[PDB]
């Protein structure tokens, strides 16, 4: 039985997760063991750099967070939570945390490196994805959310900017900066404006159904090349989202439109993923009729795109200014990050 196999798989995954969640791993490397290659991304907290593990020659994406900046930006809980989730999860489409450590100034998370880069870059380059291309990525997200939701984790920041592509053309969910492990409802205003479910905008209690709404936004943006609700400023985007109105490009198939009407559903008692049959309402939808869910999970499906090569191995990535990694002689924010 396929259904009893799903139940047994998830029961084992929860047992594995809870063991790691209760006793997280800490201090599994040191900065002196890595060579910096290039900055891949910069933000408020700090940055992500491509690095080489000197002992093996393996490459990784190292997230560097300045402890003082994290404290100033009120991100202590978010930082500790992101690391705690990353070390406890295990799914083929979730980025692996290889090592983590801290020094006087910084927190370090050494992650699996995804050389295919952002889905965002490819989507804006190509304009839009064909429906089979969009469907392949959408199927990965469905399975990822079925896994995360089973562990009572709400993701809350789905967007092309967050979805990396690996060597096999498969996507990888990477950023857990807003994910929360909660059973009932939650109230925080977080996420990205275009991707917010109306109940988030309206300050109502919300649950895992917000991720199914964000999936609708993602599918739409992938298939259209632009999101369903956009405007000059976030407040104007919120107005469109809460309106209860959506328009589709003429090239969208009838099946795609029907799936999107069920995901981009204001009414929580009607939203797909949130009904009695849960995720099976999405998995069994006509738009996914050609999807072999087990073959996607087993990574047996040939990806629609497998990532012009210029000088070096980072030639297709944007150029960030290479800034120093300063390690103060004084320990900063020791008590705040003792669990890291």
């Amino acid at each position: 039985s396929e259904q009893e196999s799903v139940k047994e798989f998830l029961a084992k995954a929860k047992e594995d997760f809870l063991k790691k969640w209760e006793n997280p791993a800490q201090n599994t490397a040191h900065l002196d063991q890595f060579e910096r290659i290039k900055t891949l991304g910069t933000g408020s907290y700090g940055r992500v750099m491509l690095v080489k593990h000197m002992e093996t020659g393996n490459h990784y994406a190292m997230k560097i967070l300045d402890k003082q900046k994290v404290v100033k930006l009120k991100q202590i809980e978010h930082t500790l939570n992101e690391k705690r989730i990353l070390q406890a999860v295990n799914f083929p489409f979730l980025v692996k945390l290889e090592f983590s450590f801290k020094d006087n100034s910084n927190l370090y998370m050494v992650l699996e490196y995804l050389p295919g880069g952002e889905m965002f870059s490819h989507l804006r380059r190509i304009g839009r994805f064909s429906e089979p291309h969009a469907r392949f990525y959408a199927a990965q997200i469905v399975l990822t959310f079925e896994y995360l939701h089973s562990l009572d984790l709400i993701y809350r920041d789905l967007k092309p900017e967050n979805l990396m592509i690996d060597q096999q053309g498969y996507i990888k969910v990477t950023d857990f900066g807003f994910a929360k492990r909660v059973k009932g409802r939650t109230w925080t205003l977080c996420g990205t404006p275009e991707y917010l479910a109306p109940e988030i905008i309206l300050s109502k209690g919300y649950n895992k159904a917000v991720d199914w709404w964000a999936l609708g936004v993602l599918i739409y943006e992938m298939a259209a090349g632009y999101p369903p609700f956009f405007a000059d400023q976030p407040i104007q985007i919120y107005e469109k989202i809460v309106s209860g109105k959506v328009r589709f490009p003429s090239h969208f198939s009838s099946d795609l439109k029907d799936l999107l009407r069920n995901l981009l559903q204001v009414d929580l008692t009607k939203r797909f993923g949130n009904l009695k049959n849960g995720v099976n309402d999405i998995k069994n939808h006509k738009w996914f009729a050609t999807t072999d869910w087990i073959a996607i999970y087993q990574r047996k499906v040939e990806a629609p795109f497998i990532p012009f090569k210029g000088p070096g191995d980072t030639s297709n990535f944007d150029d960030y200014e290479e800034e120093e990694i300063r390690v103060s002689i004084n320990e900063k924010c020791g008590k705040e990050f003792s669990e890291f």
Binding site: F120, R124, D157, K159, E161, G177, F178, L189, C190, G191, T192, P193, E194, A224, G225, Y226, F230, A231, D232, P234, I237, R247, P249
Partner: peptide
């Protein structure tokens, strides 16, 4: 067109979380 409106929005670049 909707595509022209998307370009005019000025939110075609990478979007930050709130």
């Amino acid at each position: 067109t909707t595509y022209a409106d998307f370009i005019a929005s000025g939110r075609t670049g990478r979007r930050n979380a709130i």
